[PDB]
PDB file of C-alpha atoms and ligand atoms in Angstrom:
ATOM      1  CA  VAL A  62      87.366  52.848  75.786  1.00 18.67           C
ATOM      2  CA  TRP A  63      85.488  54.309  78.768  1.00 22.27           C
ATOM      3  CA  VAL A  64      85.841  57.811  79.122  1.00 23.72           C
ATOM      4  CA  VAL A  65      83.418  58.794  76.134  1.00 21.43           C
ATOM      5  CA  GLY A  66      80.552  56.800  78.036  1.00 21.05           C
ATOM      6  CA  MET A  67      80.545  58.167  81.731  1.00 21.14           C
ATOM      7  CA  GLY A  68      80.633  61.648  80.424  1.00 22.25           C
ATOM      8  CA  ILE A  69      77.154  61.029  78.810  1.00 20.89           C
ATOM      9  CA  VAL A  70      75.933  59.795  82.409  1.00 19.63           C
ATOM     10  CA  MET A  71      77.260  62.786  84.056  1.00 20.09           C
ATOM     11  CA  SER A  72      75.482  65.121  81.409  1.00 19.65           C
ATOM     12  CA  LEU A  73      72.349  63.435  81.753  1.00 19.70           C
ATOM     13  CA  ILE A  74      72.209  63.600  85.396  1.00 19.89           C
ATOM     14  CA  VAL A  75      73.097  67.296  85.340  1.00 19.57           C
ATOM     15  CA  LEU A  76      70.552  68.192  82.759  1.00 18.49           C
ATOM     16  CA  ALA A  77      67.782  66.063  84.668  1.00 17.63           C
ATOM     17  CA  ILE A  78      68.425  67.897  87.975  1.00 18.50           C
ATOM     18  CA  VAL A  79      68.318  71.514  86.396  1.00 19.75           C
ATOM     19  CA  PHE A  80      65.096  70.873  84.550  1.00 20.43           C
ATOM     20  CA  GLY A  81      63.476  69.392  87.400  1.00 15.97           C
ATOM     21  CA  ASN A  82      64.246  71.977  89.659  1.00 20.34           C
ATOM     22  CA  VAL A  83      63.527  74.968  87.035  1.00 23.71           C
ATOM     23  CA  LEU A  84      60.328  73.505  86.039  1.00 22.01           C
ATOM     24  CA  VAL A  85      58.998  73.430  89.571  1.00 22.75           C
ATOM     25  CA  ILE A  86      60.370  76.564  90.523  1.00 22.40           C
ATOM     26  CA  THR A  87      58.806  78.830  87.683  1.00 22.66           C
ATOM     27  CA  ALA A  88      55.502  76.941  88.199  1.00 19.58           C
ATOM     28  CA  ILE A  89      55.212  78.111  91.610  1.00 20.35           C
ATOM     29  CA  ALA A  90      56.349  81.603  90.577  1.00 18.53           C
ATOM     30  CA  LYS A  91      54.348  82.223  87.386  1.00 20.64           C
ATOM     31  CA  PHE A  92      51.009  80.975  88.521  1.00 22.29           C
ATOM     32  CA  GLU A  93      48.451  83.015  90.210  1.00 23.10           C
ATOM     33  CA  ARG A  94      47.052  80.668  92.823  1.00 23.15           C
ATOM     34  CA  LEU A  95      49.862  78.141  93.629  1.00 22.71           C
ATOM     35  CA  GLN A  96      50.923  80.231  96.498  1.00 21.90           C
ATOM     36  CA  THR A  97      50.549  78.322  99.796  1.00 19.31           C
ATOM     37  CA  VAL A  98      52.318  78.051 103.149  1.00 18.88           C
ATOM     38  CA  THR A  99      53.075  74.644 102.504  1.00 21.17           C
ATOM     39  CA  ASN A 100      54.525  75.322  98.988  1.00 19.34           C
ATOM     40  CA  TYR A 101      57.450  77.758 100.134  1.00 18.17           C
ATOM     41  CA  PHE A 102      59.335  75.053 101.938  1.00 12.50           C
ATOM     42  CA  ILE A 103      59.225  73.185  98.699  1.00 15.07           C
ATOM     43  CA  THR A 104      60.383  76.439  97.040  1.00 14.46           C
ATOM     44  CA  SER A 105      63.612  76.614  99.446  1.00 15.67           C
ATOM     45  CA  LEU A 106      64.533  72.908  98.668  1.00 16.31           C
ATOM     46  CA  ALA A 107      64.135  73.435  94.843  1.00 16.53           C
ATOM     47  CA  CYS A 108      66.410  76.189  95.266  1.00 17.97           C
ATOM     48  CA  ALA A 109      68.936  74.430  97.189  1.00 21.12           C
ATOM     49  CA  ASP A 110      68.661  71.405  94.433  1.00 18.70           C
ATOM     50  CA  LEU A 111      69.332  74.120  91.690  1.00 20.39           C
ATOM     51  CA  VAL A 112      72.388  75.269  93.281  1.00 20.12           C
ATOM     52  CA  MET A 113      73.736  71.799  94.014  1.00 20.37           C
ATOM     53  CA  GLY A 114      73.081  70.842  90.343  1.00 18.09           C
ATOM     54  CA  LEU A 115      74.388  74.073  88.933  1.00 16.23           C
ATOM     55  CA  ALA A 116      77.444  74.122  90.918  1.00 16.69           C
ATOM     56  CA  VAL A 117      78.690  71.239  92.669  1.00 17.60           C
ATOM     57  CA  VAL A 118      78.176  68.125  90.232  1.00 17.56           C
ATOM     58  CA  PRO A 119      79.714  69.475  86.993  1.00 18.52           C
ATOM     59  CA  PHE A 120      83.217  70.339  88.566  1.00 16.55           C
ATOM     60  CA  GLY A 121      83.283  67.194  90.509  1.00 17.84           C
ATOM     61  CA  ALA A 122      82.714  65.326  87.270  1.00 18.59           C
ATOM     62  CA  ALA A 123      85.626  66.941  85.614  1.00 21.55           C
ATOM     63  CA  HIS A 124      87.769  66.251  88.616  1.00 23.27           C
ATOM     64  CA  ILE A 125      86.827  62.458  88.420  1.00 22.84           C
ATOM     65  CA  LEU A 126      87.235  62.124  84.718  1.00 23.66           C
ATOM     66  CA  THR A 127      90.339  64.317  84.357  1.00 23.79           C
ATOM     67  CA  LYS A 128      91.684  63.047  87.713  1.00 21.42           C
ATOM     68  CA  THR A 129      93.674  66.407  87.790  1.00 17.56           C
ATOM     69  CA  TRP A 130      92.139  69.679  89.103  1.00 19.44           C
ATOM     70  CA  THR A 131      93.019  72.542  86.855  1.00 17.82           C
ATOM     71  CA  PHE A 132      91.945  75.581  89.280  1.00 17.84           C
ATOM     72  CA  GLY A 133      93.178  76.655  92.746  1.00 18.19           C
ATOM     73  CA  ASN A 134      92.769  75.386  96.342  1.00 19.98           C
ATOM     74  CA  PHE A 135      90.682  78.130  97.599  1.00 24.50           C
ATOM     75  CA  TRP A 136      88.338  77.250  94.783  1.00 23.07           C
ATOM     76  CA  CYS A 137      88.509  73.635  96.238  1.00 20.37           C
ATOM     77  CA  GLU A 138      87.806  74.824  99.645  1.00 20.26           C
ATOM     78  CA  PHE A 139      84.793  77.001  98.443  1.00 20.37           C
ATOM     79  CA  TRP A 140      83.266  73.916  96.500  1.00 15.89           C
ATOM     80  CA  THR A 141      83.510  71.854  99.537  1.00 12.53           C
ATOM     81  CA  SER A 142      81.759  74.462 101.493  1.00 12.91           C
ATOM     82  CA  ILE A 143      79.150  74.772  98.838  1.00  7.51           C
ATOM     83  CA  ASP A 144      78.554  71.124  99.011  1.00  9.67           C
ATOM     84  CA  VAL A 145      78.134  70.874 102.546  1.00 11.15           C
ATOM     85  CA  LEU A 146      75.635  73.731 102.504  1.00 10.05           C
ATOM     86  CA  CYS A 147      73.533  72.302  99.846  1.00  8.76           C
ATOM     87  CA  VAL A 148      73.415  68.932 101.485  1.00 10.27           C
ATOM     88  CA  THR A 149      72.422  69.954 104.825  1.00  7.29           C
ATOM     89  CA  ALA A 150      69.757  72.704 103.602  1.00  8.70           C
ATOM     90  CA  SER A 151      68.224  69.835 101.798  1.00  9.80           C
ATOM     91  CA  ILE A 152      67.795  67.769 104.776  1.00  9.98           C
ATOM     92  CA  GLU A 153      66.559  70.267 107.234  1.00  9.29           C
ATOM     93  CA  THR A 154      64.067  71.464 104.623  1.00 10.21           C
ATOM     94  CA  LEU A 155      62.871  67.984 104.204  1.00 10.88           C
ATOM     95  CA  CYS A 156      62.497  67.587 107.938  1.00 12.74           C
ATOM     96  CA  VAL A 157      60.533  70.924 108.320  1.00  8.69           C
ATOM     97  CA  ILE A 158      58.246  69.833 105.544  1.00  9.14           C
ATOM     98  CA  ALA A 159      57.613  66.443 107.750  1.00  9.81           C
ATOM     99  CA  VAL A 160      56.904  68.604 110.796  1.00  7.67           C
ATOM    100  CA  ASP A 161      54.611  70.812 108.983  1.00  9.15           C
ATOM    101  CA  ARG A 162      52.674  67.813 107.845  1.00 11.80           C
ATOM    102  CA  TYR A 163      52.447  66.294 111.413  1.00 14.50           C
ATOM    103  CA  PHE A 164      51.154  69.875 112.579  1.00 14.50           C
ATOM    104  CA  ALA A 165      48.481  69.957 109.863  1.00 16.00           C
ATOM    105  CA  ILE A 166      47.269  66.611 110.586  1.00 20.39           C
ATOM    106  CA  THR A 167      47.586  66.213 114.549  1.00 22.81           C
ATOM    107  CA  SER A 168      45.747  69.585 115.367  1.00 22.91           C
ATOM    108  CA  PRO A 169      43.444  70.532 112.515  1.00 23.95           C
ATOM    109  CA  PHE A 170      41.727  73.416 114.456  1.00 23.90           C
ATOM    110  CA  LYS A 171      44.872  75.064 115.750  1.00 19.28           C
ATOM    111  CA  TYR A 172      46.950  74.610 112.647  1.00 20.61           C
ATOM    112  CA  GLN A 173      45.997  78.209 111.244  1.00 23.23           C
ATOM    113  CA  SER A 174      47.172  79.782 114.327  1.00 22.33           C
ATOM    114  CA  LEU A 175      50.707  78.024 114.625  1.00 26.65           C
ATOM    115  CA  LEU A 176      51.922  78.592 110.964  1.00 26.01           C
ATOM    116  CA  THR A 177      51.207  81.926 109.051  1.00 26.23           C
ATOM    117  CA  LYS A 178      52.478  83.619 106.126  1.00 28.32           C
ATOM    118  CA  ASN A 179      54.806  85.509 108.588  1.00 30.33           C
ATOM    119  CA  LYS A 180      56.060  82.416 110.557  1.00 29.90           C
ATOM    120  CA  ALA A 181      57.206  80.402 107.505  1.00 29.46           C
ATOM    121  CA  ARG A 182      59.921  83.043 106.347  1.00 28.96           C
ATOM    122  CA  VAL A 183      61.477  83.002 109.789  1.00 28.77           C
ATOM    123  CA  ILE A 184      61.704  79.212 109.865  1.00 34.21           C
ATOM    124  CA  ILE A 185      63.293  79.114 106.282  1.00 38.51           C
ATOM    125  CA  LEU A 186      65.806  81.821 106.808  1.00 40.17           C
ATOM    126  CA  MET A 187      66.754  80.101 110.503  1.00 42.45           C
ATOM    127  CA  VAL A 188      67.047  76.911 108.303  1.00 42.01           C
ATOM    128  CA  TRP A 189      69.454  78.366 105.794  1.00 42.75           C
ATOM    129  CA  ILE A 190      71.466  80.208 108.286  1.00 39.47           C
ATOM    130  CA  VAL A 191      72.053  77.105 110.751  1.00 39.13           C
ATOM    131  CA  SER A 192      73.135  75.379 107.180  1.00 39.19           C
ATOM    132  CA  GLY A 193      75.307  77.812 106.393  1.00 36.19           C
ATOM    133  CA  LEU A 194      77.109  78.344 109.805  1.00 33.70           C
ATOM    134  CA  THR A 195      77.583  74.350 109.922  1.00 33.57           C
ATOM    135  CA  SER A 196      79.670  74.548 106.854  1.00 33.95           C
ATOM    136  CA  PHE A 197      81.192  77.756 105.891  1.00 31.09           C
ATOM    137  CA  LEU A 198      82.571  78.402 109.545  1.00 29.54           C
ATOM    138  CA  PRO A 199      84.569  75.250 109.976  1.00 31.65           C
ATOM    139  CA  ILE A 200      86.024  75.046 106.428  1.00 31.39           C
ATOM    140  CA  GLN A 201      86.591  78.566 105.121  1.00 31.24           C
ATOM    141  CA  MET A 202      88.494  79.164 108.573  1.00 29.76           C
ATOM    142  CA  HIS A 203      91.237  76.499 108.306  1.00 28.27           C
ATOM    143  CA  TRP A 204      89.723  74.489 111.329  1.00 29.35           C
ATOM    144  CA  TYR A 205      88.934  71.009 109.979  1.00 30.56           C
ATOM    145  CA  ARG A 206      92.210  70.085 108.687  1.00 25.95           C
ATOM    146  CA  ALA A 207      94.133  66.691 109.680  1.00 25.67           C
ATOM    147  CA  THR A 208      97.552  66.381 111.391  1.00 26.69           C
ATOM    148  CA  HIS A 209      98.759  63.381 109.536  1.00 28.46           C
ATOM    149  CA  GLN A 210     101.734  63.717 107.221  1.00 31.23           C
ATOM    150  CA  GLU A 211      99.736  62.075 104.435  1.00 33.15           C
ATOM    151  CA  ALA A 212      96.880  64.837 104.887  1.00 29.24           C
ATOM    152  CA  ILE A 213      99.396  67.841 105.205  1.00 28.78           C
ATOM    153  CA  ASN A 214     101.008  66.505 101.824  1.00 27.56           C
ATOM    154  CA  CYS A 215      97.369  66.729 100.420  1.00 27.13           C
ATOM    155  CA  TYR A 216      96.948  70.432 101.874  1.00 27.56           C
ATOM    156  CA  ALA A 217     100.449  71.614 100.491  1.00 29.55           C
ATOM    157  CA  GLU A 218     100.068  70.105  97.094  1.00 29.35           C
ATOM    158  CA  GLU A 219      98.276  72.461  95.139  1.00 27.49           C
ATOM    159  CA  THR A 220      97.245  70.304  92.419  1.00 26.17           C
ATOM    160  CA  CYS A 221      95.190  67.630  94.242  1.00 27.56           C
ATOM    161  CA  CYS A 222      92.641  68.352  97.086  1.00 26.13           C
ATOM    162  CA  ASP A 223      91.043  65.489  98.999  1.00 26.13           C
ATOM    163  CA  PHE A 224      88.679  65.455 101.798  1.00 26.52           C
ATOM    164  CA  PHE A 225      90.305  64.607 105.078  1.00 22.59           C
ATOM    165  CA  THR A 226      88.659  65.660 108.395  1.00 24.18           C
ATOM    166  CA  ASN A 227      89.441  65.073 112.088  1.00 21.88           C
ATOM    167  CA  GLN A 228      87.197  62.571 113.983  1.00 20.98           C
ATOM    168  CA  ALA A 229      85.386  65.002 116.154  1.00 15.61           C
ATOM    169  CA  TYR A 230      84.371  67.356 113.165  1.00 11.05           C
ATOM    170  CA  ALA A 231      83.086  64.376 111.351  1.00  5.74           C
ATOM    171  CA  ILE A 232      80.902  63.079 114.103  1.00  5.88           C
ATOM    172  CA  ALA A 233      79.475  66.508 114.764  1.00  6.60           C
ATOM    173  CA  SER A 234      78.850  67.159 111.294  1.00  7.83           C
ATOM    174  CA  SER A 235      77.292  64.015 110.532  1.00  7.53           C
ATOM    175  CA  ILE A 236      74.957  64.305 113.686  1.00  9.13           C
ATOM    176  CA  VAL A 237      73.870  67.785 112.710  1.00 10.23           C
ATOM    177  CA  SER A 238      73.211  67.072 109.247  1.00 10.62           C
ATOM    178  CA  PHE A 239      71.506  63.617 109.125  1.00 11.74           C
ATOM    179  CA  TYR A 240      70.618  61.722 112.336  1.00 13.05           C
ATOM    180  CA  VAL A 241      68.555  64.288 114.016  1.00 13.51           C
ATOM    181  CA  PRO A 242      66.118  64.865 110.782  1.00 15.79           C
ATOM    182  CA  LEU A 243      66.170  61.077 110.562  1.00 17.43           C
ATOM    183  CA  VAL A 244      64.800  60.659 114.157  1.00 19.21           C
ATOM    184  CA  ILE A 245      62.332  63.445 113.701  1.00 16.32           C
ATOM    185  CA  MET A 246      60.869  61.954 110.340  1.00 18.25           C
ATOM    186  CA  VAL A 247      60.524  58.747 111.925  1.00 18.00           C
ATOM    187  CA  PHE A 248      58.583  59.579 114.857  1.00 17.91           C
ATOM    188  CA  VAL A 249      56.347  62.035 112.617  1.00 19.01           C
ATOM    189  CA  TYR A 250      55.557  59.275 110.234  1.00 17.77           C
ATOM    190  CA  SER A 251      54.807  56.832 112.736  1.00 12.24           C
ATOM    191  CA  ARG A 252      52.369  58.901 114.384  1.00 13.58           C
ATOM    192  CA  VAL A 253      50.697  60.134 111.025  1.00 12.55           C
ATOM    193  CA  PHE A 254      50.401  56.246 109.958  1.00 11.13           C
ATOM    194  CA  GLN A 255      48.801  55.406 113.141  1.00 12.97           C
ATOM    195  CA  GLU A 256      46.200  58.376 113.011  1.00 11.90           C
ATOM    196  CA  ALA A 257      45.488  57.337 109.361  1.00 13.90           C
ATOM    197  CA  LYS A 258      45.052  53.454 110.513  1.00 14.14           C
ATOM    198  CA  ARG A 259      42.619  54.740 113.301  1.00 15.76           C
ATOM    199  CA  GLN A 260      40.512  56.962 111.058  1.00 18.94           C
ATOM    200  CA  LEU A 261      40.191  53.724 108.514  1.00 18.85           C
ATOM    201  CA  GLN A 262      39.089  51.484 111.412  1.00 16.58           C
ATOM    202  CA  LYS A 263      36.687  54.086 112.559  1.00 15.70           C
ATOM    203  CA  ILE A 264      34.885  54.428 109.015  1.00 16.66           C
ATOM    204  CA  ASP A 265      34.109  50.584 108.920  1.00 18.12           C
ATOM    205  CA  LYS A 266      31.828  50.778 111.694  1.00 15.16           C
ATOM    206  CA  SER A 267      29.383  52.778 110.081  1.00 15.32           C
ATOM    207  CA  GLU A 268      29.947  52.286 106.182  1.00 13.22           C
ATOM    208  CA  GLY A 269      28.691  48.833 106.694  1.00 12.44           C
ATOM    209  CA  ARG A 270      27.310  46.607 103.733  1.00 13.24           C
ATOM    210  CA  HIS A 300      47.138  49.949 102.285  1.00  9.56           C
ATOM    211  CA  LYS A 301      47.446  53.278 100.220  1.00 11.10           C
ATOM    212  CA  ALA A 302      48.691  55.434 102.872  1.00 11.05           C
ATOM    213  CA  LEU A 303      51.199  52.545 103.787  1.00 10.95           C
ATOM    214  CA  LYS A 304      52.592  52.748 100.268  1.00  9.09           C
ATOM    215  CA  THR A 305      52.685  56.313 100.055  1.00  8.97           C
ATOM    216  CA  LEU A 306      54.561  56.543 103.483  1.00  8.71           C
ATOM    217  CA  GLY A 307      56.921  53.622 102.417  1.00  7.66           C
ATOM    218  CA  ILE A 308      57.761  55.270  99.275  1.00  4.83           C
ATOM    219  CA  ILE A 309      58.395  58.602 100.879  1.00  6.29           C
ATOM    220  CA  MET A 310      60.450  57.368 103.656  1.00  9.99           C
ATOM    221  CA  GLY A 311      62.351  54.572 101.766  1.00  5.82           C
ATOM    222  CA  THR A 312      63.521  56.933  98.763  1.00  6.33           C
ATOM    223  CA  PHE A 313      65.579  59.245 101.295  1.00  5.42           C
ATOM    224  CA  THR A 314      66.648  56.562 103.516  1.00  2.00           C
ATOM    225  CA  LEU A 315      67.944  54.355 100.732  1.00  5.96           C
ATOM    226  CA  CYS A 316      69.412  57.264  99.059  1.00  3.82           C
ATOM    227  CA  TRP A 317      71.438  58.910 101.922  1.00  3.51           C
ATOM    228  CA  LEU A 318      71.844  56.244 104.785  1.00  5.46           C
ATOM    229  CA  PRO A 319      74.927  54.374 103.663  1.00  3.49           C
ATOM    230  CA  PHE A 320      77.078  57.425 103.242  1.00  2.42           C
ATOM    231  CA  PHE A 321      76.643  58.627 106.686  1.00  2.00           C
ATOM    232  CA  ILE A 322      77.465  55.384 108.051  1.00  2.00           C
ATOM    233  CA  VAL A 323      80.533  54.959 106.079  1.00  4.15           C
ATOM    234  CA  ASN A 324      81.504  58.596 107.000  1.00  5.05           C
ATOM    235  CA  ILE A 325      81.351  57.900 110.669  1.00  5.03           C
ATOM    236  CA  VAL A 326      83.054  54.367 110.443  1.00  4.50           C
ATOM    237  CA  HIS A 327      85.821  55.330 108.296  1.00  2.57           C
ATOM    238  CA  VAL A 328      87.443  57.634 110.732  1.00  2.00           C
ATOM    239  CA  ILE A 329      87.561  55.514 113.733  1.00  2.85           C
ATOM    240  CA  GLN A 330      89.500  52.828 112.049  1.00  2.00           C
ATOM    241  CA  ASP A 331      91.039  53.789 108.786  1.00  2.00           C
ATOM    242  CA  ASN A 332      91.998  50.202 107.496  1.00  2.00           C
ATOM    243  CA  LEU A 333      88.391  49.173 106.455  1.00  2.00           C
ATOM    244  CA  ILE A 334      87.353  51.820 103.768  1.00  2.00           C
ATOM    245  CA  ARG A 335      89.237  53.227 100.696  1.00  2.00           C
ATOM    246  CA  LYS A 336      88.366  56.123  98.566  1.00  2.00           C
ATOM    247  CA  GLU A 337      86.555  54.589  95.682  1.00  2.00           C
ATOM    248  CA  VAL A 338      83.962  53.115  97.935  1.00  2.00           C
ATOM    249  CA  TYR A 339      83.625  56.468  99.737  1.00  2.00           C
ATOM    250  CA  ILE A 340      83.109  58.393  96.494  1.00  2.00           C
ATOM    251  CA  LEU A 341      80.510  55.765  95.161  1.00  2.00           C
ATOM    252  CA  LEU A 342      78.687  56.021  98.181  1.00  2.00           C
ATOM    253  CA  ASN A 343      78.763  59.853  98.048  1.00  2.00           C
ATOM    254  CA  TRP A 344      77.681  60.095  94.347  1.00  2.00           C
ATOM    255  CA  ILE A 345      74.518  58.139  95.261  1.00  2.00           C
ATOM    256  CA  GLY A 346      73.176  60.802  97.560  1.00  2.00           C
ATOM    257  CA  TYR A 347      73.446  63.509  94.678  1.00  2.00           C
ATOM    258  CA  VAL A 348      70.861  61.671  92.574  1.00  2.00           C
ATOM    259  CA  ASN A 349      68.391  62.074  95.437  1.00  2.00           C
ATOM    260  CA  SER A 350      67.984  65.489  94.743  1.00  2.00           C
ATOM    261  CA  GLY A 351      66.993  64.909  91.242  1.00  2.00           C
ATOM    262  CA  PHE A 352      64.200  62.769  92.518  1.00  2.00           C
ATOM    263  CA  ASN A 353      62.712  64.676  94.787  1.00  2.00           C
ATOM    264  CA  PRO A 354      60.804  67.246  92.916  1.00  2.00           C
ATOM    265  CA  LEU A 355      59.506  64.404  90.890  1.00  2.00           C
ATOM    266  CA  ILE A 356      58.125  62.835  94.278  1.00  2.00           C
ATOM    267  CA  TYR A 357      56.844  65.948  95.936  1.00  2.00           C
ATOM    268  CA  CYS A 358      55.241  67.494  92.876  1.00  2.00           C
ATOM    269  CA  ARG A 359      52.292  65.180  92.159  1.00  2.00           C
ATOM    270  CA  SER A 360      49.434  67.253  93.135  1.00  2.00           C
ATOM    271  CA  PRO A 361      46.790  67.645  90.201  1.00  2.00           C
ATOM    272  CA  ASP A 362      47.321  71.425  90.516  1.00  2.00           C
ATOM    273  CA  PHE A 363      50.711  71.041  89.617  1.00  2.00           C
ATOM    274  CA  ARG A 364      50.034  68.660  86.782  1.00  2.00           C
ATOM    275  CA  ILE A 365      47.486  71.471  85.440  1.00  2.00           C
ATOM    276  CA  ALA A 366      50.366  74.204  85.891  1.00  2.00           C
ATOM    277  CA  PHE A 367      52.845  71.969  84.061  1.00  2.00           C
ATOM    278  CA  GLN A 368      50.403  71.127  81.252  1.00  2.00           C
ATOM    279  CA  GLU A 369      49.803  74.817  80.878  1.00  2.00           C
ATOM    280  CA  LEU A 370      53.475  75.455  80.260  1.00  2.00           C
ATOM    281  CA  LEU A 371      53.999  72.926  77.767  1.00  2.00           C
TER     282      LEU A 371
HETATM  283  C1  G1I B   1      83.132  66.274  99.269  1.00  2.00           C
HETATM  284  N1  G1I B   1      81.794  65.491 100.019  1.00  2.00           N
HETATM  285  C2  G1I B   1      81.304  65.673 101.048  1.00  2.00           C
HETATM  286  C3  G1I B   1      82.059  65.383 102.436  1.00  2.00           C
HETATM  287  C4  G1I B   1      81.475  65.206 103.739  1.00  2.00           C
HETATM  288  C5  G1I B   1      80.224  66.009 103.979  1.00  2.00           C
HETATM  289  C6  G1I B   1      79.332  65.593 102.801  1.00  2.00           C
HETATM  290  C7  G1I B   1      77.826  66.217 103.048  1.00  2.00           C
HETATM  291  C8  G1I B   1      77.447  66.470 104.333  1.00  2.00           C
HETATM  292  C9  G1I B   1      78.324  66.573 105.466  1.00  2.00           C
HETATM  293  O1  G1I B   1      78.060  66.796 106.875  1.00  2.00           O
HETATM  294  C10 G1I B   1      79.476  66.103 105.167  1.00  2.00           C
HETATM  295  O2  G1I B   1      80.480  66.159 106.415  1.00  2.00           O
HETATM  296  C11 G1I B   1      79.717  65.284 101.406  1.00  2.00           C
HETATM  297  O3  G1I B   1      78.982  65.895 100.445  1.00  2.00           O
END
C-alpha cells in the first residue's frame, strides 16, 4: 500500500525538472535580445540539468521501486558516469557564475576587457571537459573498483549494481567536485556583501533628512543545505564502514538531485525573463 504513491512523487519531480529546464533554454534561444555574456553560463547549467532530469532520475527511480535492475552492467557503468558528469558540471558552472559576478562588481571599468564573447566559450568548454575527464576516465576504465569480497560479489553479479569505491578515489572526487567551488563561492560572496555594505554606508552621508543580506542568504543557503550533507557522508563512510548504511546514503543523495530543479527558478527572476515567459504562454 505504498508502491502506487512514491511513483507519483518521482514523476512529479521528473516533470518539474524537465519543464523548468526546457522553458529557460527555449526562452534564451528564441528571443532576440536575451543574449548576454552572463546568460551563456546559465545556458550551460540548464543544459546540464536537462540531461540530469532526462537520463539519471528515471532509471534510478525504476531501480529503487523494482529493487531489480533489468538491464546490463555496462549500462550501469554508463549511468554512473553520466550522473557524476552532470553533478560536477552543475557545481562548477555555479562557481563560474559566482566568479563572473565578483569580476563584474569588484572591477567595473575593466569588466569588459576581461570577459568578452570569445572568452566565455573557452571557459565553458574547459569546465565541461574537466567535468568529463573527472567522471568517465576513472569509471569507464575499470579503475575505481574495490577489492573487498562483498564488493567483488557485486561486480561479478550481473543483476545488481551498487556503488563501492576505494577511499582515495572518493576523497579526490569529492575534493575536486565540491570543496573548492564552495570555498570560492564563500570568498566571493563575502567580498560582494562587504562592498554592498560599504556603498550603503556611503549613501547615507549625503542622502540625509538588508535586501542584499536576504538575497545572498537565500542564494548560498539553497546550495549549501541541498548538497552539503551528501559530501560529508561520502567522505566519512569510507574511513569507518560501521557508521553508515545504504539507505541513509541514498536519502542524502536524492536530496541533491532536487536542487537542480530549484535552480532555474532562483536564477531566472529578472523582469526580462518574466516578459519572455509571458510572451510564450
Ligand atoms: C550514484 N550516486 C553518485 C555516487 C558518488 C558521487 C556522486 C556525485 C558526484 C561525485 O563526485 C561522486 O563521487 C553521486 O551522484
